[PDB]
Paper text:
The [name] is a AAA+ protein found in prokaryotes, archaea, and eukaryotic organelles. [name] is involved in cellular protein homeostasis by degrading damaged or misfolded abnormal proteins, which prevents these unwanted protein species from forming toxic aggregates. [name] is known to form a homohexamer; each protomer is composed of multiple domains, including an N-terminal substrate-binding globular domain (NGD), a long-helix domain (LH), a three-helix bundle (3H), a AAA+ ATPase module, and a protease domain. We show here, using cryo-electron microscopy (cryo-EM), that the activation process of the [name] AAA+ protease may involve a pentameric assembly and a substrate-dependent incorporation of the sixth protomer to form the substrate-pore-loop contacts seen in the translocating state.
To provide a comparative context, we also examined wild-type [name] in two states: without any nucleotide ([name]-Apo) and incubated with 5 mM ADP ([name]:ADP). Additionally, our cryo-EM structures of a series of spiral subcomplex oligomers of [name] determined by 3D reconstructions suggest a sequential pathway for the construction of the THT. In the proposed pathway, the THT is formed by sequential incorporation of the protomers, beginning with Ob1 and progressing in the clockwise direction through Ob5, and completed by the incorporation of Ac6*, whose binding mode is dependent on the substrate.
Author numbering:
A (entry chain B), C (entry chain A): 243 to 774
B (entry chain C): 319 to 476
D (entry chain C): 636 to 774
């Protein structure tokens, strides 16, 4: 059987380490046995082909310039001007730390941001920069550590981990690996794979990476890693060492629009073959953004411009009746359908009992409508929508301020003995956990008991305390990008956050009219439509 | 059946993209048409009718109840009893280099294996790594570059 | 199968004792079949590999030179010169640590203190001195004995508790192993996790460690265990048998400054491979200490000097124009951006219903403002924070004292008919037995029902006896350190802690002003803007 | 969704003939016949609101008019999605009248006439409006 000869010459083919060479030759001289029963040459054959084809001693040339990378990051979406700098910082430290202190250093760049924004693109830009190759590996639903480690060389039909498939696809030893969705692993079967990730991840324990299919542990000691995420709260503590957060925030609609013209819509029109035939005036791109997507980034716009490209190709195919096909913001619906969303959220028309909190889920910021019903009763405080007592303390504290400040806001002097509250909070357990929306509930309860309408398109965030001082929250950037994606102009913030606002890059600020306050009394001054 | 008024619009749109092809326009980013429905609303008639309207030879090869990379792939080509997968067996049953192949109920997959064969699906179903497609019983790449697909299901959740 | 030809060696190539050969027979009964989907035999041979590769008969070079240990610990974190004397006299007394031996005590050498100090690295330096090996794992995130005892070895997925795994990850059979956060567990599954630690507890009870997974017991006798906890409020009582407590308190600002000069900076510079091309002045270092980090460890200084190193790396990469940039305290916002905390706490401006106490948290005693809402009502009391009820009865004592001292401060004689109270403590859920905010809450409620302002920057603590006397508490050192560093000067301590005043160096005692008081009327004359 | 329906109703005990308190006295037992719908969440809010009001007033619900939607704590009937699905289900089972949110006239236009040509859709905005349809026998 010349398959033995093929296995032998594939050992003769590829370079390999010393113990790998000895184990491969002595396992090569186990052959000439049962093909068909307990298959004593086939599983060894597949085992030897795994031990020959996997790349040893083969390398990509690498770049050692940062300015090249600064150009290539100013060609992706818009540059973003802000978090290309962090990637420069880590890559800069990687340039200097090559003089033999590479080990046990160097976090692995968790890149946190809502799904679809330029993360995989960022890996593309970096791998373009360095003359590396590229791969992706998705880690949603991995529970077996032997999906990460090898799995036992027992019978034919046994296969190694994710990571050695991926290191087998490339032909060199030094790729880039975008570990997709590292915060979504499970462990209900044997083995908790977070420990295997700490085996993979650390630059001293990568080098002895545990392999159950292979004998010899592989060397991840040259694989540049990079790693996605969506939420820091599902990220554990042992992974949280050797990770510098790179905070990818949401986009702004002017950044979205120039992202369309410079980078989205020519790629779509190059897709469906209409090259140089249809054009879109930019008011129509604004019609598309402001009315046919509510997300963070470049998924909604990719779908909408795809459907425009296809419908245009069909309409062209039954006659070529124009010179160019221009499109205004009026005949987008011909290509796409009914009005889904409102133009701005100024079409929102003040309610009686409902407040509008800025909030940030870790997969895209949003509004919340906290809804309050003052029903006749005894004085309970029911908080549905999956809440702990941090929200209950916030509600009790805002009600305590009202118990201090009845007459200032047109209320009965005794109501806490007689009026039950039911409170619906649509998912108020989201990160930035606990209250970052205390003033929201203050205006909500003031609205519901005051019987006076709470305005809309004035949407805020922050904490309160018992005397009624509005305390500063952290992370004003994410909350303002929520207010800026969801089509809101007017924001109210604590006065103690006016040190944060001056670090905000001017795209984010200059659409918005910030009404800085310092009391609960001041948001009940602005936000209510009559003053009670 | 009666026209359906709405799906054959979208099918003409997808085919209108397949018009603007056939050069070395490398736009192989191509969605592969997950048809979705209840039990029995006229899917395989759409498959047959498209294959007739394009003069191609329709051939179902269903993939319901799968958890193995051996329905798709070969075996130990060392003893009598080694056989290729459902695809090259289908391309033996049908005999054209450019068929239409209605894969069937692809949301009935399962998992009693280390590795869902959804990745083994993902080798053939891409327009790129179809072009090197080889089973264990095979040696040389049989391409599927000319082989138009279509795929039903019953729920997009699973 | 073919693996039995190797596994017949694997039991008699590993040095195994007689009961180990007995458990080898116990597994060998279940061996010697076909492995065609055999879930019991799979975990049988897996447990067999656990039996083989875990080592035997390997003692260590374990040196016993006291001034050697002292000289290794002369480089430790800063010295601290007392608690290293405690450990040096541990190893100077202990010829009993399985050397010259009796059955008298085997203490466990517990540590409780700041989360960020080098008590872990003290354990590292200990293992360097003992010349044994090291491991660590968190006992935080433990609620179960499935992590200590293995699973029920009767089907596939029975895996050992990770103590056996960690002893597999030591090639010899008497190392020193660390446990971390021993005191953060819950009685949830498989009974008490502390019951498993009671089986581990005594040095001959762990010699017979049986499991749901092991059958014939494993040796745990020679391996020195030591813990590392950080809660300063409770101690678990079933471990009080055979225990030696070694505490570590916080620091002074200038000691942290010295630590930044000594050890932290050259490591942060060598993480970015700089050759010391960047100097920071101690003026600027103390500015970093004041304005940025509020901790009693070296975590914050570690990361922020990491930031300065990395920013300096990226600036130096864009051109070589330097021999040194001695960075001063003004262009630190060139690198670190905005500084968060203030050197100035003269901006405090006495509020109506507040106080500012010194609590005893599991990072040490710190500052916490306690907020009070006196509302009209029905004489009630509510706490928030889900406190230790020493806060509740301290509120009881404070209220009864003010009911005995109504007219002398100007209070209305009735308030338990008309006024409810809501009391927020930020973190008084500690098991600090006794309030460390008794007179704090007393001051606050007197200020609140007074409707008179309450001066800040006067950090007070202790308890209230029911006879109007200020009861003493311990742990005075860390709280005086916290009030020193946070920008507070006036202290209100009991008289009956006067020998604890001896227990601190005069740098703590020459930035402050400690008032021995014992009548509560004295301090309530001291704080309010009216003299009563 | 059940408690939201009760919240609306507790605000509106005058209008429907309920006794002036009823939260103190009546335990509520709910049977939802379905095993596991891949549609999760309340696509049947005013379904439960009508069931609850008809039960607590002991007055029969007309089992002739199909309905769907979501609810909210004052009666603001939110819109729902998948209207082609629910209308095809409402006409395969031989029902001819469907109650929908008033936020679904813009959704009630893109459908083929093949589907809209049996039904008589009667759009409403508030929970009081579905209780004007389905509560004929007030005595």
């Amino acid at each position: 059987l010349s398959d033995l000869e093929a296995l032998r010459k594939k050992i003769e083919e590829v370079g390999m380490p010393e113990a790998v060479k000895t184990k491969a030759l002595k396992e090569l001289d186990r052959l000439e046995r049962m093909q068909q029963g307990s298959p004593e040459a086939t599983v060894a054959r597949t085992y030897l082909d795994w031990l020959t084809e996997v790349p040893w001693s083969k390398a990509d040339p690498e770049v050692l310039d940062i300015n090249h990378t600064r150009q290539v990051l100013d060609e992706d979406h818009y540059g973003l001007k802000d978090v290309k700098e962090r990637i420069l910082e880590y890559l800069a430290v990687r340039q200097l730390t090559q003089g033999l202190d590479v080990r046990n250093k160097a976090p692995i760049l968790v890149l946190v941001g809502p799904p679809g924004v330029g993360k995989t693109s960022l890996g593309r830009s970096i791998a373009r920069s360095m003359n590396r190759k590229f791969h992706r590996i998705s880690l949603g639903g991995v529970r077996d550590e032997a999906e990460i480690r090898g799995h036992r060389r027992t019978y034919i039909g046994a296969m190694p981990g994710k990571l050695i498939h991926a290191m087998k696809q490339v032909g060199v030893i030094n790729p880039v690996i975008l570990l997709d969705e590292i915060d979504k692993m499970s462990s209900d079967w044997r083995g908790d794979p977070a420990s295997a990730m700490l085996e993979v991840l650390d630059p001293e324990q990568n080098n002895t990476f545990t392999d159950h299919y292979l004998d010899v542990p592989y060397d991840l000691s040259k694989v540049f890693f990079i790693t996605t995420a969506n939420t820091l709260q599902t990220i554990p503590r042992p992974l949280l060492d050797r990770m510098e957060v790179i905070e990818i925030p949401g986009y702004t609609n002017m950044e979205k629009q120039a992202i369309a013209r410079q980078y989205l819509w020519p790629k779509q029109v190059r897709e469906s073959g209409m090259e140089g035939r249809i054009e879109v005036t930019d008011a129509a791109i604004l019609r598309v953004i402001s009315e046919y997507t509510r997300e963070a980034g470049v998924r909604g716009l990719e779908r909408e411009l795809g459907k425009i490209a296809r419908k245009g190709a069909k309409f062209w195919l039954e006659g070529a009746w124009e010179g160019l096909r221009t499109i205004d913001a009026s005949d987008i619906p011909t290509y796409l359908g009914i009005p889904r969303y409102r133009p701005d959220k100024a079409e929102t028309e003040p309610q009686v009992g409902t407040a509008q909190g800025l909030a940030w889920t870790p997969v895209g910021g949003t509004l919340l409508t906290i809804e309050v019903a003052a029903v006749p009763g005894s004085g309970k405080l029911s908080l549905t929508g999956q809440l702990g007592e941090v929200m209950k303390e916030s509600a009790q504290a805002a009600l305590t301020y009202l118990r201090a400040h009845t007459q200032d806001y047109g209320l009965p002097e005794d109501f806490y003995n007689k009026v039950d509250l039911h409170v619906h909070v649509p998912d108020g357990a989201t990160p930035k956990d606990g209250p970052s929306a205390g003033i929201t509930m203050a205006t909500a309860i003031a609205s519901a008991l005051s019987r006076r309408p709470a305005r809309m398109d004035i949407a805020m965030t922050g904490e309160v305390s018992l005397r009624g001082k509005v305390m500063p929250i952290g992370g004003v950037k994410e909350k303002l990008l929520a207010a800026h994606q969801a089509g809101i102009h007017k924001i109210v913030l604590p006065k103690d956050n006016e040190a944060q606002l001056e670090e905000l890059p001017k795209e984010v600020l200059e659409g918005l009219e910030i009404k800085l306050v310092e009391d609960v009394g001041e948001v009940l001054e602005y936000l209510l439509l009559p003053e009670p």
